[PDB]
Design a protein around this ligand. Structure first.
Ligand SMILES: O=P(O)(O)OC[C@H]1O[C@](O)(CO)[C@@H](O)[C@@H]1O
Ligand SMILES: [Mg+2]
Ligand SMILES: [Mg+2]
Ligand SMILES: [Tl+]
Ligand SMILES: [Tl+]
Ligand SMILES: [Tl+]
Ligand SMILES: [Tl+]
Length: 331
């Protein structure tokens, strides 16, 4: 009651014995501020007329919504002001953003300011995704500082604007969930050291793409619906917002899939600010995250807006699908 374990307190105490300049706390405190401001706009978006498009398109091809602009501006401004960052990569910006010398700190942040664009207008859960790297280079900060493999992440996670607003944060020792208290505008710890189940009973994929799926995905799905051992078939869930489907995978277990297909060699989701952050969360929770052929966190990106296939969740479910890919593997 009068001893609130806030996100700030947790990350300060975490980074205590480990020493540190304390800019990670600065960064996350700043991010939390933009997340609250996004949550409040979202929760009254119809009244504030924030539905509808902005009138523009993303890089490879994406219709930019009003809340994309708002959330993008908020995240960039708070990150800059935090004095903790030097390079920013956003889904909404064609090029990396370089922070001004005076406000530069040591971190590189890749983010999706608003994830779940197709679900905005129907009031389904949407979110914010981020991954944070330490700049390694010694030269002037540049776009290349963002082109690190996922395994180099120091922290990653997401905000979920669902039935409640939740900040899920993964760092080297594990995953923790903080719920926004709307009364005092603080993220409070509600789930400690989260670990995903070894095996789940939900599969999550858009079967609208059945016609384009590779034979391994096709086989796996058939197996969920017609188990060979007479076990009960898996239930299906696909909210359509990566943050919502991945969060459910984390807390209920199971598998989430956005694979490569006949029209999309690399899938749809973006490696730097969608796939890597979630793969990292999953791995810190004891889960797996693969493209079907390689670990997502091991990919070395060459494009900040690069796409990747992703299959993640409970280790025994992801493994079962890898076995099918392996079985189908060819010259
Ligand atoms: O409509 P589709 O192709 O299933 O795409 C849904 C995916 O697209 C995204 O909106 C990309 O931002 C994800 O949040 C989501 O998982
Ligand atoms: Mg977005
Ligand atoms: Mg997204
Ligand atoms: Tl977008
Ligand atoms: Tl969006
Ligand atoms: Tl995407
Ligand atoms: Tl995207």
């Amino acid at each position: 009651d009068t001893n609130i374990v806030t996100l700030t307190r947790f990350v300060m105490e975490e980074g205590r014995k480990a020493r540190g300049t304390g800019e990670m706390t600065q960064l996350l405190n700043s991010l939390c501020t933009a997340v609250k401001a996004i949550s409040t706009a979202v929760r009254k978006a119809g009244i504030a007329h924030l539905y509808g498009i902005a009138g523009s398109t993303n890089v490879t091809g994406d219709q930019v919504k009003k809340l994309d602009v708002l959330s993008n501006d908020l995240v960039i401004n708070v990150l800059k002001s935090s004095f903790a960052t030097c390079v920013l990569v956003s889904e909404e910006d064609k090029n990396a953003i370089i922070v001004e010398p005076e406000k530069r700190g040591k971190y590189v942040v890749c983010f999706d300011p608003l994830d779940g664009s197709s679900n905005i207008d129907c009031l389904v859960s949407i979110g914010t995704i981020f991954g944070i790297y330490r700049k390694n280079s010694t030269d002037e900060p540049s776009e290349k500082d963002a082109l690190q493999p996922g395994r180099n992440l120091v922290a990653a996670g997401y905000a979920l604007y669902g039935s409640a607003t939740m900040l899920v944060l993964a760092m080297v020792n594990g995953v923790n969930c903080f719920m926004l208290d709307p009364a005092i505008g603080e993220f409070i710890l509600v789930d400690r050291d989260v670990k995903i189940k070894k095996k789940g009973s939900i599969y999550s994929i858009n079967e609208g793409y059945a016609k384009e799926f590779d034979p391994a995905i096709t086989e796996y799905i058939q197996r969920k619906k017609f188990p060979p051992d007479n076990s009960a078939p898996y239930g299906a869930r696909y909210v359509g917002s990566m943050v919502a489907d991945v969060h459910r995978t984390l807390v209920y277990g199971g598998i989430f899939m956005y694979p490569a297909n006949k029209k999309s060699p690399k899938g749809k989701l973006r490696l730097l600010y969608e796939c890597n952050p979630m793969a990292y969360v999953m791995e810190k929770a004891g889960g797996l995250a693969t493209t079907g052929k390689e670990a997502v966190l091991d990919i070395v990106p060459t494009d900040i807006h690069q796409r990747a296939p992703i299959i993640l969740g409970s280790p025994e479910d992801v493994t079962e699908l890898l076995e099918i890919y392996q079985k189908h593997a060819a010259k």
